[PDB]
mmCIF file with all atom_site columns, C-alpha atoms in Angstrom:
data_model
loop_
_atom_site.group_PDB
_atom_site.id
_atom_site.type_symbol
_atom_site.label_atom_id
_atom_site.label_alt_id
_atom_site.label_comp_id
_atom_site.label_asym_id
_atom_site.label_entity_id
_atom_site.label_seq_id
_atom_site.pdbx_PDB_ins_code
_atom_site.Cartn_x
_atom_site.Cartn_y
_atom_site.Cartn_z
_atom_site.occupancy
_atom_site.B_iso_or_equiv
_atom_site.pdbx_formal_charge
_atom_site.auth_seq_id
_atom_site.auth_comp_id
_atom_site.auth_asym_id
_atom_site.auth_atom_id
_atom_site.pdbx_PDB_model_num
ATOM 1   C CA . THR P 1 1   ? -24.175 0.113   0.261   1.00 27.46 ? 152 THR P CA 1
ATOM 2   C CA . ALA P 1 2   ? -21.788 -1.758  2.554   1.00 26.29 ? 153 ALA P CA 1
ATOM 3   C CA . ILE P 1 3   ? -20.224 -4.723  0.737   1.00 23.66 ? 154 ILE P CA 1
ATOM 4   C CA . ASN P 1 4   ? -18.104 -7.204  2.703   1.00 24.73 ? 155 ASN P CA 1
ATOM 5   C CA . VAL P 1 5   ? -15.005 -7.425  0.503   1.00 24.38 ? 156 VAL P CA 1
ATOM 6   C CA . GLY P 1 6   ? -13.034 -9.322  3.147   1.00 27.02 ? 157 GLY P CA 1
ATOM 7   C CA . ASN P 1 7   ? -13.997 -12.932 2.389   1.00 28.35 ? 158 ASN P CA 1
ATOM 8   C CA . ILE P 1 8   ? -12.413 -13.676 -0.998  1.00 29.06 ? 159 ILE P CA 1
ATOM 9   C CA . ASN P 1 9   ? -9.856  -16.281 -2.039  1.00 27.39 ? 160 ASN P CA 1
ATOM 10  C CA . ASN P 1 10  ? -7.040  -15.478 -4.450  1.00 23.07 ? 161 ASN P CA 1
ATOM 11  C CA . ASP P 1 11  ? -7.966  -17.938 -7.220  1.00 22.42 ? 162 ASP P CA 1
ATOM 12  C CA . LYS P 1 12  ? -11.498 -16.588 -7.843  1.00 21.31 ? 163 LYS P CA 1
ATOM 13  C CA . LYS P 1 13  ? -10.515 -12.960 -7.214  1.00 20.22 ? 164 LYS P CA 1
ATOM 14  C CA . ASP P 1 14  ? -11.119 -11.549 -10.701 1.00 18.77 ? 165 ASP P CA 1
ATOM 15  C CA . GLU P 1 15  ? -14.578 -13.130 -11.017 1.00 17.58 ? 166 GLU P CA 1
ATOM 16  C CA . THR P 1 16  ? -16.025 -11.888 -7.719  1.00 20.30 ? 167 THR P CA 1
ATOM 17  C CA . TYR P 1 17  ? -14.553 -8.418  -8.316  1.00 18.74 ? 168 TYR P CA 1
ATOM 18  C CA . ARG P 1 18  ? -16.177 -7.777  -11.695 1.00 18.25 ? 169 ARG P CA 1
ATOM 19  C CA . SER P 1 19  ? -19.338 -9.235  -10.152 1.00 21.68 ? 170 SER P CA 1
ATOM 20  C CA . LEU P 1 20  ? -18.939 -6.721  -7.312  1.00 19.82 ? 171 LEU P CA 1
ATOM 21  C CA . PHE P 1 21  ? -18.941 -3.792  -9.758  1.00 21.05 ? 172 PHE P CA 1
ATOM 22  C CA . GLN P 1 22  ? -21.750 -5.304  -11.807 1.00 23.16 ? 173 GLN P CA 1
ATOM 23  C CA . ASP P 1 23  ? -23.472 -5.261  -8.409  1.00 24.72 ? 174 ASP P CA 1
ATOM 24  C CA . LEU P 1 24  ? -22.246 -1.682  -7.904  1.00 28.29 ? 175 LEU P CA 1
ATOM 25  C CA . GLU P 1 25  ? -23.617 -0.966  -11.390 1.00 26.72 ? 176 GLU P CA 1
ATOM 26  C CA . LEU P 1 26  ? -27.181 -1.800  -10.314 1.00 23.07 ? 177 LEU P CA 1
ATOM 27  C CA . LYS P 1 27  ? -27.088 1.287   -8.080  1.00 23.83 ? 178 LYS P CA 1
ATOM 28  C CA . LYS P 1 28  ? -24.986 3.113   -10.717 1.00 24.49 ? 179 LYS P CA 1
ATOM 29  C CA . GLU P 1 29  ? -22.670 3.691   -7.768  1.00 22.50 ? 180 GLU P CA 1
ATOM 30  C CA . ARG P 1 30  ? -20.121 6.405   -8.567  1.00 23.87 ? 181 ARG P CA 1
ATOM 31  C CA . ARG P 1 31  ? -19.009 7.159   -4.979  1.00 25.17 ? 182 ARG P CA 1
ATOM 32  C CA . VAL P 1 32  ? -17.124 4.396   -3.163  1.00 30.01 ? 183 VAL P CA 1
ATOM 33  C CA . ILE P 1 33  ? -15.326 4.234   0.185   1.00 28.98 ? 184 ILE P CA 1
ATOM 34  C CA . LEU P 1 34  ? -12.668 1.540   0.593   1.00 29.91 ? 185 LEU P CA 1
ATOM 35  C CA . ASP P 1 35  ? -11.595 1.462   4.276   1.00 29.00 ? 186 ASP P CA 1
ATOM 36  C CA . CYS P 1 36  ? -9.216  -1.476  3.978   1.00 33.89 ? 187 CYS P CA 1
ATOM 37  C CA . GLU P 1 37  ? -5.616  -2.430  4.654   1.00 36.09 ? 188 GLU P CA 1
ATOM 38  C CA . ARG P 1 38  ? -3.081  -0.753  2.373   1.00 35.17 ? 189 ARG P CA 1
ATOM 39  C CA . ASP P 1 39  ? -2.340  -4.134  0.770   1.00 35.69 ? 190 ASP P CA 1
ATOM 40  C CA . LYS P 1 40  ? -5.972  -4.763  -0.207  1.00 36.23 ? 191 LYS P CA 1
ATOM 41  C CA . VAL P 1 41  ? -6.192  -1.222  -1.626  1.00 36.09 ? 192 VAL P CA 1
ATOM 42  C CA . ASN P 1 42  ? -3.797  -1.712  -4.545  1.00 36.41 ? 193 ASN P CA 1
ATOM 43  C CA . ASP P 1 43  ? -5.559  -4.963  -5.446  1.00 41.11 ? 194 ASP P CA 1
ATOM 44  C CA . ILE P 1 44  ? -8.904  -3.141  -5.578  1.00 39.47 ? 195 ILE P CA 1
ATOM 45  C CA . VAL P 1 45  ? -7.393  -0.185  -7.450  1.00 40.09 ? 196 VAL P CA 1
ATOM 46  C CA . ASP P 1 46  ? -5.946  -2.467  -10.135 1.00 37.50 ? 197 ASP P CA 1
ATOM 47  C CA . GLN P 1 47  ? -9.144  -4.303  -11.092 1.00 38.84 ? 198 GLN P CA 1
ATOM 48  C CA . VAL P 1 48  ? -10.842 -0.887  -11.186 1.00 39.60 ? 199 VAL P CA 1
ATOM 49  C CA . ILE P 1 49  ? -8.499  0.223   -13.971 1.00 39.85 ? 200 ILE P CA 1
ATOM 50  C CA . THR P 1 50  ? -9.057  -2.964  -15.979 1.00 35.61 ? 201 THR P CA 1
ATOM 51  C CA . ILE P 1 51  ? -12.834 -2.491  -16.093 1.00 37.20 ? 202 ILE P CA 1
ATOM 52  C CA . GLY P 1 52  ? -12.462 1.263   -16.613 1.00 40.59 ? 203 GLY P CA 1
ATOM 53  C CA . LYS P 1 53  ? -14.236 2.668   -13.540 1.00 40.06 ? 204 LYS P CA 1
ATOM 54  C CA . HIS P 1 54  ? -11.789 5.508   -13.005 1.00 38.79 ? 205 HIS P CA 1
ATOM 55  C CA . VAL P 1 55  ? -12.624 8.052   -15.752 1.00 37.61 ? 206 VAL P CA 1
ATOM 56  C CA . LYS P 1 56  ? -14.411 11.368  -15.193 1.00 35.03 ? 207 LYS P CA 1
ATOM 57  C CA . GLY P 1 57  ? -17.416 10.581  -13.010 1.00 39.86 ? 208 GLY P CA 1
ATOM 58  C CA . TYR P 1 58  ? -16.202 8.368   -10.168 1.00 39.26 ? 209 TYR P CA 1
ATOM 59  C CA . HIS P 1 59  ? -14.978 9.451   -6.743  1.00 39.23 ? 210 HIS P CA 1
ATOM 60  C CA . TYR P 1 60  ? -13.121 7.144   -4.352  1.00 40.05 ? 211 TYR P CA 1
ATOM 61  C CA . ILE P 1 61  ? -12.318 7.669   -0.668  1.00 41.47 ? 212 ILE P CA 1
ATOM 62  C CA . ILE P 1 62  ? -9.380  5.750   0.820   1.00 44.67 ? 213 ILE P CA 1
ATOM 63  C CA . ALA P 1 63  ? -10.098 5.383   4.547   1.00 44.01 ? 214 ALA P CA 1
ATOM 64  C CA . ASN P 1 64  ? -6.660  4.728   6.008   1.00 42.05 ? 215 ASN P CA 1
ATOM 65  C CA . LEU P 1 65  ? -3.783  6.840   7.292   1.00 44.80 ? 216 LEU P CA 1
ATOM 66  C CA . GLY P 1 66  ? -1.614  5.873   4.314   1.00 47.22 ? 217 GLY P CA 1
ATOM 67  C CA . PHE P 1 67  ? -2.803  7.847   1.304   1.00 44.63 ? 218 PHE P CA 1
ATOM 68  C CA . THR P 1 68  ? 0.642   8.500   -0.203  1.00 45.37 ? 219 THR P CA 1
ATOM 69  C CA . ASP P 1 69  ? 2.135   5.275   1.192   1.00 47.25 ? 220 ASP P CA 1
ATOM 70  C CA . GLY P 1 70  ? 0.807   3.272   -1.759  1.00 47.71 ? 221 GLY P CA 1
ATOM 71  C CA . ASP P 1 71  ? 1.109   3.951   -5.474  1.00 49.17 ? 222 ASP P CA 1
ATOM 72  C CA . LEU P 1 72  ? -1.207  6.670   -6.778  1.00 49.04 ? 223 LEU P CA 1
ATOM 73  C CA . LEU P 1 73  ? 0.351   7.625   -10.134 1.00 47.55 ? 224 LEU P CA 1
ATOM 74  C CA . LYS P 1 74  ? -1.640  4.873   -11.874 1.00 45.05 ? 225 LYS P CA 1
ATOM 75  C CA . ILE P 1 75  ? -5.105  6.296   -11.120 1.00 40.54 ? 226 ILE P CA 1
ATOM 76  C CA . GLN P 1 76  ? -3.740  9.818   -11.507 1.00 42.81 ? 227 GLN P CA 1
ATOM 77  C CA . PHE P 1 77  ? -4.754  10.353  -15.161 1.00 41.69 ? 228 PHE P CA 1
ATOM 78  C CA . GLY P 1 78  ? -8.097  8.502   -15.441 1.00 40.54 ? 229 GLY P CA 1
ATOM 79  C CA . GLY P 1 79  ? -10.390 11.415  -14.598 1.00 36.25 ? 230 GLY P CA 1
ATOM 80  C CA . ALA P 1 80  ? -11.951 10.260  -11.349 1.00 32.84 ? 231 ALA P CA 1
ATOM 81  C CA . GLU P 1 81  ? -11.479 12.144  -8.094  1.00 32.34 ? 232 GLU P CA 1
ATOM 82  C CA . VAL P 1 82  ? -9.684  10.310  -5.286  1.00 31.14 ? 233 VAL P CA 1
ATOM 83  C CA . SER P 1 83  ? -9.388  11.267  -1.618  1.00 32.41 ? 234 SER P CA 1
ATOM 84  C CA . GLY P 1 84  ? -7.690  9.870   1.441   1.00 37.04 ? 235 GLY P CA 1
ATOM 85  C CA . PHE P 1 85  ? -5.943  10.611  4.717   1.00 39.27 ? 236 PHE P CA 1
ATOM 86  C CA . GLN P 1 86  ? -2.283  11.280  5.574   1.00 37.24 ? 237 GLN P CA 1
ATOM 87  C CA . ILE P 1 87  ? -0.723  11.521  9.040   1.00 36.49 ? 238 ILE P CA 1
ATOM 88  C CA . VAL P 1 88  ? 2.913   11.761  7.974   1.00 39.39 ? 239 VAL P CA 1
ATOM 89  C CA . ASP P 1 89  ? 3.489   15.341  6.810   1.00 38.49 ? 240 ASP P CA 1
ATOM 90  C CA . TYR P 1 90  ? 6.427   15.286  4.385   1.00 39.69 ? 241 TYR P CA 1
ATOM 91  C CA . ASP P 1 91  ? 6.661   19.107  4.412   1.00 39.94 ? 242 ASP P CA 1
ATOM 92  C CA . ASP P 1 92  ? 7.734   19.347  8.066   1.00 43.31 ? 243 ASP P CA 1
ATOM 93  C CA . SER P 1 93  ? 11.398  19.897  8.884   1.00 40.15 ? 244 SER P CA 1
ATOM 94  C CA . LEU P 1 94  ? 11.432  17.076  11.452  1.00 43.44 ? 245 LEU P CA 1
ATOM 95  C CA . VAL P 1 95  ? 10.475  14.452  8.866   1.00 44.80 ? 246 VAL P CA 1
ATOM 96  C CA . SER P 1 96  ? 12.771  16.192  6.365   1.00 46.16 ? 247 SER P CA 1
ATOM 97  C CA . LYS P 1 97  ? 15.754  15.660  8.674   1.00 42.51 ? 248 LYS P CA 1
ATOM 98  C CA . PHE P 1 98  ? 14.479  12.073  8.970   1.00 42.24 ? 249 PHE P CA 1
ATOM 99  C CA . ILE P 1 99  ? 13.989  11.491  5.236   1.00 41.68 ? 250 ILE P CA 1
ATOM 100 C CA . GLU P 1 100 ? 17.406  12.955  4.380   1.00 42.87 ? 251 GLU P CA 1
ATOM 101 C CA . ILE T 2 1   ? -5.825  8.275   -19.626 1.00 41.99 ? 202 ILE T CA 1
ATOM 102 C CA . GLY T 2 2   ? -8.775  5.881   -19.646 1.00 42.79 ? 203 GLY T CA 1
ATOM 103 C CA . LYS T 2 3   ? -9.857  6.045   -23.301 1.00 42.62 ? 204 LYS T CA 1
ATOM 104 C CA . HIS T 2 4   ? -10.626 2.313   -23.473 1.00 40.50 ? 205 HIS T CA 1
ATOM 105 C CA . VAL T 2 5   ? -14.032 2.157   -21.749 1.00 39.91 ? 206 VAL T CA 1
ATOM 106 C CA . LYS T 2 6   ? -17.319 1.357   -23.480 1.00 40.96 ? 207 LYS T CA 1
ATOM 107 C CA . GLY T 2 7   ? -17.509 3.706   -26.452 1.00 42.71 ? 208 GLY T CA 1
ATOM 108 C CA . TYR T 2 8   ? -14.126 3.457   -28.153 1.00 38.75 ? 209 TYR T CA 1
ATOM 109 C CA . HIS T 2 9   ? -13.278 0.873   -30.805 1.00 36.56 ? 210 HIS T CA 1
ATOM 110 C CA . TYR T 2 10  ? -9.730  0.170   -31.994 1.00 37.88 ? 211 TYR T CA 1
ATOM 111 C CA . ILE T 2 11  ? -8.288  -1.752  -34.945 1.00 36.38 ? 212 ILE T CA 1
ATOM 112 C CA . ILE T 2 12  ? -4.903  -3.494  -34.910 1.00 39.84 ? 213 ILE T CA 1
ATOM 113 C CA . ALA T 2 13  ? -3.506  -3.429  -38.452 1.00 43.29 ? 214 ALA T CA 1
ATOM 114 C CA . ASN T 2 14  ? -0.927  -6.189  -38.363 1.00 39.24 ? 215 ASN T CA 1
ATOM 115 C CA . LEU T 2 15  ? -1.012  -9.880  -39.193 1.00 42.24 ? 216 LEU T CA 1
ATOM 116 C CA . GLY T 2 16  ? -0.189  -10.719 -35.570 1.00 44.57 ? 217 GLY T CA 1
ATOM 117 C CA . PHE T 2 17  ? -3.148  -10.100 -33.285 1.00 45.92 ? 218 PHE T CA 1
ATOM 118 C CA . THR T 2 18  ? -2.502  -12.698 -30.563 1.00 46.25 ? 219 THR T CA 1
ATOM 119 C CA . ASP T 2 19  ? 1.262   -12.122 -30.872 1.00 45.08 ? 220 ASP T CA 1
ATOM 120 C CA . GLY T 2 20  ? 1.407   -9.217  -28.414 1.00 44.07 ? 221 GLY T CA 1
ATOM 121 C CA . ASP T 2 21  ? -0.020  -8.879  -24.923 1.00 42.41 ? 222 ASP T CA 1
ATOM 122 C CA . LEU T 2 22  ? -3.676  -7.883  -25.189 1.00 42.98 ? 223 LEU T CA 1
ATOM 123 C CA . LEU T 2 23  ? -5.267  -9.120  -21.946 1.00 41.92 ? 224 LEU T CA 1
ATOM 124 C CA . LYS T 2 24  ? -4.612  -5.547  -20.742 1.00 41.78 ? 225 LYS T CA 1
ATOM 125 C CA . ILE T 2 25  ? -7.679  -4.221  -22.612 1.00 45.81 ? 226 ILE T CA 1
ATOM 126 C CA . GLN T 2 26  ? -9.652  -7.462  -22.406 1.00 44.06 ? 227 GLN T CA 1
ATOM 127 C CA . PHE T 2 27  ? -12.068 -5.987  -19.835 1.00 43.17 ? 228 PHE T CA 1
ATOM 128 C CA . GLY T 2 28  ? -11.977 -2.238  -20.519 1.00 42.29 ? 229 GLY T CA 1
ATOM 129 C CA . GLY T 2 29  ? -15.328 -2.191  -22.333 1.00 42.28 ? 230 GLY T CA 1
ATOM 130 C CA . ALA T 2 30  ? -14.025 -0.913  -25.658 1.00 43.90 ? 231 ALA T CA 1
ATOM 131 C CA . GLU T 2 31  ? -14.072 -3.180  -28.703 1.00 42.76 ? 232 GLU T CA 1
ATOM 132 C CA . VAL T 2 32  ? -10.850 -4.411  -30.308 1.00 40.96 ? 233 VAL T CA 1
ATOM 133 C CA . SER T 2 33  ? -10.499 -6.097  -33.699 1.00 42.35 ? 234 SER T CA 1
ATOM 134 C CA . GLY T 2 34  ? -7.359  -7.403  -35.342 1.00 40.14 ? 235 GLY T CA 1
ATOM 135 C CA . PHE T 2 35  ? -5.838  -9.806  -37.850 1.00 39.98 ? 236 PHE T CA 1
ATOM 136 C CA . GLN T 2 36  ? -4.243  -13.229 -37.395 1.00 42.03 ? 237 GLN T CA 1
ATOM 137 C CA . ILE T 2 37  ? -2.337  -15.030 -40.145 1.00 43.55 ? 238 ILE T CA 1
ATOM 138 C CA . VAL T 2 38  ? -1.021  -17.730 -37.796 1.00 44.17 ? 239 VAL T CA 1
ATOM 139 C CA . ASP T 2 39  ? -4.242  -19.532 -36.874 1.00 43.98 ? 240 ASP T CA 1
ATOM 140 C CA . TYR T 2 40  ? -3.259  -21.230 -33.611 1.00 43.26 ? 241 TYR T CA 1
ATOM 141 C CA . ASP T 2 41  ? -6.450  -23.279 -34.047 1.00 43.30 ? 242 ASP T CA 1
ATOM 142 C CA . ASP T 2 42  ? -5.153  -24.989 -37.196 1.00 43.20 ? 243 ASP T CA 1
ATOM 143 C CA . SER T 2 43  ? -3.932  -28.524 -36.560 1.00 42.61 ? 244 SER T CA 1
ATOM 144 C CA . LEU T 2 44  ? -0.409  -28.028 -37.925 1.00 45.29 ? 245 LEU T CA 1
ATOM 145 C CA . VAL T 2 45  ? 0.243   -25.033 -35.664 1.00 43.08 ? 246 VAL T CA 1
ATOM 146 C CA . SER T 2 46  ? -1.019  -26.939 -32.607 1.00 43.29 ? 247 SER T CA 1
ATOM 147 C CA . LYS T 2 47  ? 1.557   -29.665 -33.239 1.00 42.86 ? 248 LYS T CA 1
ATOM 148 C CA . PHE T 2 48  ? 4.083   -26.866 -33.795 1.00 40.73 ? 249 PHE T CA 1
ATOM 149 C CA . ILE T 2 49  ? 3.311   -24.963 -30.579 1.00 39.46 ? 250 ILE T CA 1
ATOM 150 C CA . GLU T 2 50  ? 3.795   -28.108 -28.481 1.00 40.74 ? 251 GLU T CA 1
#
């Protein structure tokens, strides 16, 4: 169920977003893939928490190389499963000598 | 923890409902009831708020 989320202005953002999940409620869609820029992720994640589509039952997939590069502690206690992709391994000694 | 979806129903037991920030759970799905002693719809308060 591919939904073009790209074309949205900032003034009518909250209206088209609830209408997008009342359109994702027709299919009772519990499994969503995002595949967007890291900036547009946190905007999507926020409205999700306000409507309450992050409790036990939903599963999101963040299709970008920056899983831990955004904030994840907010949707960490809702109940839903979240997945993503990370290229920067913060357990390697080379990045450790870089992070230090 | 997400206990504000459709199913829960809270009650605010103070005389100041619209005094605190409550837009936060305005779309969660749960129902919220409270109490307001300062009716911002009364005419005297509208001239006061200005």
